[PDB]
């Protein structure tokens, strides 16, 4: 059991798949997932195929072997998001592409952070189609659930999902995979908002292909966004206008968090070390003068 990969993705050959998420009939956005085929190929392939639907009808359930239209039936804030029961939509169903249940391939990765994709199960070797996305480190699960991918785009969408109203652990509004599938190398991420607004920027700035600390570029994006908002404003589409306006604020906040983090991670340490060395240097010099004092004294 090892730390999950930090790079997004961990490996460019690994499958990239997606979920377009709707809540209360509202399109929230896209989650893009990397599947760790390199580590758990058999677990990755089952999930990958369940994203395309390409295997057709499932023999033990009679439903399509597909996550399309599959709701998230169990959500616990500060823990995880669970879905994949496309046959019973309540955690008792679903099925793999190999038969109902296949074995725990391995437990090579730890649930060491948010955004990890892991197999739900009902004990050893009961993997089906059900899965969860963690929203925090979930170490108690290690060795009991196979981790087999991670979020690489749209964690902000996972965040919104994490926060829906629930009754018990069942979401009050319907939380569903409106669409899903696999991305070809080079396809577009499909993470700009599918709203016809001409807005090409990802819903969350951390997903954009831009150095967020580059202030001039963020203002270009912000100006675009604000123009789009003004257009909605001109069309009396206030809610859509507020959406766009709110999005530049997200981009401005992302830029600031980016600058701050990088500073704390990279410059603060080296500045700390320099001040430490200076204090050392100050001792050396006071010592050399103490020594010289006595002498010439």
Curated annotation (Swiss-Prot):
GO MF entries: cyclosporin A binding; Hsp70 protein binding; Hsp90 protein binding; nuclear estrogen receptor binding; peptidyl-prolyl cis-trans isomerase activity; transcription factor binding
Enzyme class: isomerase
Activity regulation behaviour: Less sensitive to inhibition by cyclosporin A than is CYP-18.
Residues found modified as Phosphoserine: 4, 197
Residues found modified as N6-acetyllysine: 170
Region called Chaperone activity, residue ranges: 184-214
Name of the protein this chain belongs to: Peptidyl-prolyl cis-trans isomerase D
Record organism: Bos taurus
Whole-protein residues included: 2 to 298 of 370
